[PDB]
From a paper:
The final step in the pathway is catalyzed by a 2-epimerase, which utilizes [name],[name],3-dideoxy-d-glucuronic acid as its substrate. The focus of this investigation is on the ORF WP_011172736, which we demonstrate encodes for a 2-epimerase. We have also demonstrated that the T. thermophilus enzyme is allosterically regulated by [name]-GlcNAc. Whereas the sugar 2-epimerases that function on [name]-GlcNAc have been the focus of past biochemical and structural analyses, this is the first detailed investigation of a 2-epimerase that specifically utilizes [name],[name],3-dideoxy-d-glucuronic acid as its substrate.
To determine whether the pH of the crystallization experiments was a contributing factor toward the binding of additional ligands, the next structure (Structure 5) was determined at pH 9.0. Again, the crystals obtained were grown in the presence [name]-GlcNAc3NAcA but in the absence of additional ligands. The model was refined to an overall R-factor of 20.4% at 2.3 Å resolution. Both subunits contained [name]-GlcNAc3NAcA in their active sites. In subunit A, the auxiliary binding pocket was empty whereas in subunit B, electron density corresponding to [name] was observed. The α-carbons for the dimer models determined at either pH 7.0 or pH 9.0 superimpose with an RMSD of 0.2 Å.
Author numbering:
A (entry chain A): 1 to 359
B (entry chain B): 2 to 362
The structure:
Amino acid sequence: MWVKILSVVGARPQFIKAAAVSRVLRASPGVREVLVHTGQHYDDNMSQVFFEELEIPDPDYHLGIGGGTHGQNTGRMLEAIEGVLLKEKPDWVLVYGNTDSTLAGALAAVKLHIPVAHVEAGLRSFNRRMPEEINRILTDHASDLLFAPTETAVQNLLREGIPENRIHLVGDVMYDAALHYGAKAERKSRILERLGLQAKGYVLATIHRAENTDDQERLRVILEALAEVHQEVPVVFPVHPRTRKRAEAFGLGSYLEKVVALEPVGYLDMVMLEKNARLIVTDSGGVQKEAYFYRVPCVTVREETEWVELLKAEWNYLAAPQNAKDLALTILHRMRTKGVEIDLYGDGRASQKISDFLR
Amino acid sequence: WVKILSVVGARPQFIKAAAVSRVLRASPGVREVLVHTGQHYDDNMSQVFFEELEIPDPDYHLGIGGGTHGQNTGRMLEAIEGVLLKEKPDWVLVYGNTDSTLAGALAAVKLHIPVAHVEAGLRSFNRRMPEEINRILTDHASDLLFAPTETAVQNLLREGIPENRIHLVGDVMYDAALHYGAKAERKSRILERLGLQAKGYVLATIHRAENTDDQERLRVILEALAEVHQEVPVVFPVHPRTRKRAEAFGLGSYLEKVVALEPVGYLDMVMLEKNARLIVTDSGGVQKEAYFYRVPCVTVREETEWVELLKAEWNYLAAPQNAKDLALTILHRMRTKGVEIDLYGDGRASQKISDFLRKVG
Ligand SMILES: CC(=O)N[C@H]1[C@@H](OP(=O)(O)OP(=O)(O)OC[C@H]2O[C@@H](n3ccc(=O)[nH]c3=O)[C@H](O)[C@@H]2O)O[C@H](C(=O)O)[C@@H](O)[C@@H]1NC(C)=O
Ligand SMILES: CC(=O)N[C@H]1[C@@H](OP(=O)(O)OP(=O)(O)OC[C@H]2O[C@@H](n3ccc(=O)[nH]c3=O)[C@H](O)[C@@H]2O)O[C@H](C(=O)O)[C@@H](O)[C@@H]1NC(C)=O
Ligand SMILES: O=c1ccn([C@@H]2O[C@H](COP(=O)(O)OP(=O)(O)O)[C@@H](O)[C@H]2O)c(=O)[nH]1
């Protein structure tokens, strides 16, 4: 009668995916949901705020693990999570995205014969030296069910020999989340007011990929280029804390003061900032998709994206950070462009399709 | 001057590492660092192999073992990462498909250190086996894949792994059997010491978790061997977990009914295998080694990875569901031989492997 579905989350974007899935599982006939918070993101603005603003139940467990190496965090999450599984003995383990928490989750589970579904499965950058590419490859090959958000993602899984009956194209749960919480963003966020921004009167930026922040010359290119764009149109930049650290350590802190630099914001503010921006500059997966949701033109500061359909639809554009001025002009150019009318990522009911396929 | 750090953990890994490290010591500039995870620690599981196979002492003993999958794998992952940051090697070599293997590749790969997997591409197609998980994730984490068979090649291709990263080299355990044969022949007195002639017994090993962690399955086996014993003597070097399980379930008595030994060394094991009438096992290595010595095998599992042994009729599966049938299967196969065919290479898999590591750039 009752199925127990246990969710493993560690990072900001995982909390947001999980919020959408929880909603559907909460009001499901006979589903008990258990939520593990691995402790990977711990601060109030990377964690707590999302549980409160997206009405996510308090986690049944907080493993309190973070701030170490790949080896440390993965190893200790692996042991801790296994401990919890051995206690809760759930039917399904759900993991999301592609951090060390995603992998430790799946790997703890498969060795206990516990079914694993990967929510957001089959994305590839095809650069195997990326920790997130390894994480999503090893996760997919260890899961039993694979919830693909796009046709590309499906063909990626088939090509690595994963059979069709274990793959379900269900669209993207972060589109679910945008729809269902959009109205709540409307009535609660007052961030345009707090920062004194007129709608479509600024650009929005996020930057945190390690290939971008650990390399001094790439990070300088990016912060120079954003400061230049500020002169022409204000830049709002909720700065990931790792990015903040790396900028401070390489002595690029002045560029941040030269734009509208923020600590990280909750999802409601973010929606409200994403919605009312003229253009979005990012290296985030979630935010590139989100720009497209609101038909705001996007520039992705990478050599590739896993969300290729956004490039084909002309709503997103690649701009590797080789040159500061080159990147600035690319950003200012793409502001007066737009993509085609097209539906991606589904109807808003990816989460409900997931719940279905799990009974 | 290239550094190659090996990660080993258990009996079959030391046998594989021995064959390979013999070639790496002979190679100009090439320094080795050997890491022992501590997964096997009893002397007849570990130190004996180091002594008889002429393997230098490990540069590190992490002394992790005897916990859960999570505990072992997790603690190994952190520990091996710590070493790798110390030694910053150019290659990490991992072997087979223990939890040690996986902790190895996972440590290495997130540090952007190239990983090579010795014995790559094997698949049982049973994810209930912790070792099916281990080789799948290892192979997907590796930059070189030293497949031992054409099956293992094809397996890797179908999981969308590029042809350039896959080399078929044969099996280093064949290099081992070949290199150490004279020394076991000359130094093993195991036959004398038991009181056995050639062709006059049956040799048996059993340690698959899926056999030992289920009582009525283990009962099936122990009894099946006890019956066989009454007809042809059964020599049975017992794995420690197998013994401790036999005790946990109260099947102890069954081991009296055959020639139960503690675990033997490779030298003694070679002679036992060489001079047996039939081998029966749930072991990876022993299956192939039976074929090496042209001795019929029975494999007490639902599947094997070594499917070529079945097709050549050197091997036969018999899942343990019924004491009586398992015994009869065994006694029938005792009368069989497979076809003459050459598997697993020319005995120089280690040389090919060494070659490929040096010339990889
Ligand atoms: C490149 C890469 O691997 N990326 C993976 C990565 O996610 P990601 O890169 O998007 O990191 P991230 O940008 O912090 O989150 C965005 C969210 O934060 C919100 N967001 C952002 C900033 C902010 O101040 N406030 C806020 O609410 C935004 O509104 C938005 O909803 O980890 C994810 C995970 O494991 O689940 C994977 O799904 C991703 N994989 C992919 C393929 O996109
Ligand atoms: C089924 C499975 O996953 N198996 C994997 C597993 O090895 P395995 O099943 O063969 O365990 P094992 O039987 O302890 O050792 C045999 C050796 O011990 C010697 N041996 C055996 C008994 C004895 O008393 N004395 C002795 O010297 C024998 O002469 C023989 O040389 O770990 C291996 C590893 O990670 O490298 C993987 O390569 C294997 N994968 C495969 C696919 O064979
Ligand atoms: O030298 C050794 C190695 C293993 N074990 C036993 O084997 C169990 C599990 O061994 P492991 O998980 O390493 O797997 P194996 O490949 O030996 O089955 C441990 O809890 C020990 O009780 C032992 O007694 N001595």
